[PDB]
């Protein structure tokens, strides 16, 4: 499929109109970031000489 670019909605603009919310929802969202990878090392004699 073509990529969904986003939520499709329209807003009405006027020079003397403002929209103010009358309610609110407290939403808790998760987001995940990596920190570190596997800490590795190589042994030279076992690698080359064996």
């Amino acid at each position: 499929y073509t990529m969904s670019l986003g939520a499709e909605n329209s807003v009405a603009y006027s020079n003397n109109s403002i929209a103010i919310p009358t309610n609110f929802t407290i939403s808790v969202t998760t987001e995940i970031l990596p920190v570190s990878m596997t800490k590795t090392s190589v042994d030279c004699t076992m690698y080359i000489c064996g």
Partner: protein
Amino acid sequence: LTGTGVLTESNKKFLPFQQFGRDIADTTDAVRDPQTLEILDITPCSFGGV
């Protein structure tokens, strides 16, 4: 097959047409001794990564 290392006893089983084994095909992990039919796996002499 000549080399330098320390050999231990192994629990591997060898097919009758197989004498030399490789787990990772760069070093011979185990050999079958020509006199006694026990299988001895060879490890590198210096190891542990000091």
